[PDB]
Design a binder for this molecule. Structure first.
Ligand code: 30A
Ligand code: 30A
Ligand code: CU
Ligand code: CU
Ligand code: NA
Ligand code: NA
Lengths: 213, 213
């Protein structure tokens, strides 16, 4: 109970576009806030948009906090991280552009991150995917998973991760780069294909189509 | 309701010495936490001592947050201020070395700070007090109040106050110096002589003697 801090990345921009009357960011915001495990939500957003969340503060069963976004996604995470409760035992990082994450999937990834130290929701990639070299030739082989959010990580591990990133200088080029640099295991919790990220005009449509089905 | 953020200055050090079994800092901590007006307490303390407060987190009706102290009292306040809720309408700064503040006095100073923008609990000075010049001669005259805490201030005013202090460079030498520099009025709410600050060995004794009377 109340052991999880959520860092909600929400920094109109796509995540504030209404989906059946409700700004996209609020769907996942509410799904987390209903979970007894979740103590607090740190929303990382431009101050312009804070009222979208703060309107619901006395109606939700979590503490709401805010953090200013950074230039890169990892900067926004770090800013978020600085606001979580000092004794939270797990941090749950979520992209607000994924409004359709199911409670049941969040529960799974929370359990796996608690168990392993670091877990991310993933689905099996449907496309044929190949590594290609700098001569544009296929790197051959004789299973790939697409990562979603949440990403759930013990805060001490995330902090050592940042310390390593900051000090060395090492690059974040994809969304699981910090934990990779540690030699700590990262579990992939199987999610749902419905947990789409809303990027395009077209995605907005897909999300409405899924909220009605 | 839940419009007030308390900045509790608690950065053994005197404020952690037991008074009938309970570290001094917890007396005012609990008095504020029982007040419906109070949304959150930001405790400004060395991380060593955080557990003293965090033990009571699920038993109190406020959000608990922490801030790292600074070198001067005003630095500790500013650190505190950076952690309060973005829409809190009043900040209540209290010295944890004043464990005996009465709820009724806190209520008064909250009302006065809300009304005026800035209020502090005070009592009439009992001693004969004189201004003295640099030749050690009395500066003559043909009513003085001793300030206590809480100090209650609208956060926007406290922030402009800090902006002015930081930029100009002006000195804080006493405990109402920031608001003085503004030309905004500061109301003195009459408190109680029992609201002692625990400094000496002897004070510790006085506080026990007052908790029993
Ligand atoms: O923000 C980025 O772009 C990023 C780059 N790397 N990386 C990470 O390693 C993590 C930690 C994590 C990965 C997998 C499962 C749980 C936590 C995060 Cl939360 N963001 C990033
Ligand atoms: O920390 C100090 O030493 C200090 C120096 N000046 N000053 C202030 O003007 C205030 C603001 C205030 C004063 C009176 C009533 C309400 C708020 C505070 Cl809260 N601390 C200080
Ligand atoms: Cu898409
Ligand atoms: Cu004394
Ligand atoms: Na509204
Ligand atoms: Na205890």
């Amino acid at each position: 109970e109340k052991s999880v801090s959520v860092i909600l990345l929400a920094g109109m921009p796509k995540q504030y576009i209404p989906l059946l009357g409700q700004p996209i960011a609020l769907y996942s915001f509410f799904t987390f806030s209903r979970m007894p495990e979740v103590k607090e939500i740190v929303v990382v957003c431009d101050p312009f948009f804070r009222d979208i969340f703060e309107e619901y503060e006395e109606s939700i069963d979590v503490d709401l906090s805010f953090a200013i976004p950074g230039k890169e996604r990892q900067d926004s995470v770090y800013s978020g991280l600085q606001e979580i409760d000092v004794n939270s035992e797990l941090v749950c990082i979520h992209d607000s552009a994924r409004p359709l994450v199911n409670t049941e999937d969040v529960e799974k990834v929370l359990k796996d991150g608690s168990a392993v130290g670091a877990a991310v929701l993933g689905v099996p990639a449907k496309a044929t995917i190949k590594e290609v070299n700098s001569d544009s030739l296929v790197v051959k082989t004789l299973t790939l998973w697409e990562m979603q959010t949440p990403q759930v990580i013990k805060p001490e591990l995330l902090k050592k991760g940042f310390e390593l990133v900051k000090s060395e200088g090492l690059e974040v080029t994809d969304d699981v780069s910090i934990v990779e640099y540690l030699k700590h295991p990262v579990y992939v919790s199987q999610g749902s294909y419905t947990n789409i990220k809303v990027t395009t005009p077209d995605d907005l449509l897909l999300a409405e189509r899924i909220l009605s089905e």
